[PDB]
Amino acid sequence: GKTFSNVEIFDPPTNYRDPQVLYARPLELSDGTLLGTWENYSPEPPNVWFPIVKSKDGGKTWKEISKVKDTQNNWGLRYQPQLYELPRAFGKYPKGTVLCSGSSIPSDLSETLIEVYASRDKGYTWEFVSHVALGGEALPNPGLTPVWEPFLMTYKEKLILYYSDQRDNATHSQKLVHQTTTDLKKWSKVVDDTKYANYYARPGMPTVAKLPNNEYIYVYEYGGGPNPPAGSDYWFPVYYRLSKDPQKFLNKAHHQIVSNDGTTPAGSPYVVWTPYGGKNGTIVVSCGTRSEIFTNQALGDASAWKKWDVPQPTAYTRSLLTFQKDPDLLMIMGAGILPPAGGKNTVSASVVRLSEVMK
Numbered sequence: 001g002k003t004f005s006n007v008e009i010f011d012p013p014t015n016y017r018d019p020q021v022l023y024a025r026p027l028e029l030s031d032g033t034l035l036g037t038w039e040n041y042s043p044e045p046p047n048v049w050f051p052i053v054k055s056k057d058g059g060k061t062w063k064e065i066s067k068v069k070d071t072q073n074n075w076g077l078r079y080q081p082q083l084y085e086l087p088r089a090f091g092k093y094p095k096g097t098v099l100c101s102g103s104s105i106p107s108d109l110s111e112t113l114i115e116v117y118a119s120r121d122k123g124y125t126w127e128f129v130s131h132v133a134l135g136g137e138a139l140p141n142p143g144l145t146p147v148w149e150p151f152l153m154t155y156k157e158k159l160i161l162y163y164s165d166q167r168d169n170a171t172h173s174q175k176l177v178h179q180t181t182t183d184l185k186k187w188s189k190v191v192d193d194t195k196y197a198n199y200y201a202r203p204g205m206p207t208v209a210k211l212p213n214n215e216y217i218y219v220y221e222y223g224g225g226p227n228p229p230a231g232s233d234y235w236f237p238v239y240y241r242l243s244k245d246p247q248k249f250l251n252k253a254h255h256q257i258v259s260n261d262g263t264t265p266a267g268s269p270y271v272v273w274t275p276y277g278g279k280n281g282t283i284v285v286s287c288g289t290r291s292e293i294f295t296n297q298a299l300g301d302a303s304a305w306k307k308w309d310v311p312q313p314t315a316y317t318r319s320l321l322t323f324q325k326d327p328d329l330l331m332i333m334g335a336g337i338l339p340p341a342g343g344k345n346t347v348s349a350s351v352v353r354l355s356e357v358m359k
């Protein structure tokens with residue numbers, strides 16, 4: 001069998017700094033190997049790194065094979081890792097190269113620097129490729145200028161790196177932006193993806209998936225979005241946009257995700273698409289404040305979102321992975337909650353079948 005529930009990947013030493021672990025991310029290679037990583041809050045020195053775990057049995061067991069380390073800044077690789085496998089070459093990086101992007105940040109949190117590292121041997125060793133984006137102080141407060149949360153995706157002959165940007169700090173508390181490259185070394189000028197006229201709005205945490213009608217779905221948390229629930233004054237509802245050209249989300253209409261029973265997912269979302277479920281496949285979305293998954297089999301029709309229970313617990317930016325050889329299988333991976341986490345975060349995962357979950 002392929003399914004399992006709550007398999008522990010990593011339990012941190014008890015002396016790791018709160019939250020100890022956070023922000024889990026998985027990747028499936030073209031040979032079926034799985035890699036995984038997370039924010040690893042070790043006592044420094046040495047500078048923090050991103051651990052790389054590998055599974056050859058579809059996620060049932062895991063072993064650390066390497067670390068991605070900051071070789072450039074003497075700061076560490078600290079926040080928001082993202083793994084990606086090149087589906088075609090980009091200059092001297094061929095198809096099957098594994099990228100790890102993430103944010104290099106000094107211990108004192110005074111700067112943020114989105115980097116790209118590459119592995120030419122399926123995750124055993126890593127090399128620095130390029131600096132992408134430099135920002136200011138690594139706290140999510142209006143007026144500071146950090147960059148955060150890289151997400152990588154190919155579109156035709158470009159590689160696009162989507163992220164959150166606080167550097168337009170006189171006009172947007174935070175906005176969503178991207179840059180593109182064709183060689184992994186030179187990055188285009190910043191292009192806006194989503195921004196809101198309310199200064200205090202904080203769209204954040206972009207993820208993107210490709211749909212079978214040649215459209216892309218772009219999902220984010222809309223901080224400051226309308227209709228915050230009773231008692232609260234600011235919330236992070238999950239919104240999305242649809243576009244044929246994934247460099248042009250900025251001019252598209254936005255849509256809140258609300259399931260047919262009225263549930264409104266909020267926080268740190270993650271989207272994938274799988275061919276499972278019909279000609280439109282299934283869009284699957286997780287959010288960071290509840291344990292269910294949200295599905296859509298109508299190409300993002302705003303009235304067609306459903307919600308289903310799964311065994312994987314709620315986690316900040318809980319992530320998802322679809323398996324190429326079996327589109328019915330979905331991995332759900334998390335590394336716990338935002339601090340204070342009380343020493344209790346671990347990295348874990350579950351693999352479910354959508355045909356079983358969606359009954």
Ligand SMILES: OC[C@@H]1O[C@@H](OC[C@@H]2O/C(=N\O)[C@H](O)[C@H]2O)[C@H](O)[C@H]1O
Nearest residue numbers: 023079080139140148164203204205
């Ligand atoms: O990854 C670690 C966390 O990141 C920092 O939050 C950054 C904000 O996260 C978002 N979603 O809630 C926004 O896009 C960013 O502004 C936080 O300090 C830390 O725990």
Ligand SMILES: [Mn+2]
Nearest residue numbers: 008010011012
């Ligand atoms: Mn243990």
Ligand SMILES: [Mn+2]
Nearest residue numbers: 011012343344
């Ligand atoms: Mn523990």
Ligand SMILES: [Mn+2]
Nearest residue numbers: 291292308309
């Ligand atoms: Mn439920």
Ligand SMILES: [Mn+2]
Nearest residue numbers: 001003353356
């Ligand atoms: Mn079964």
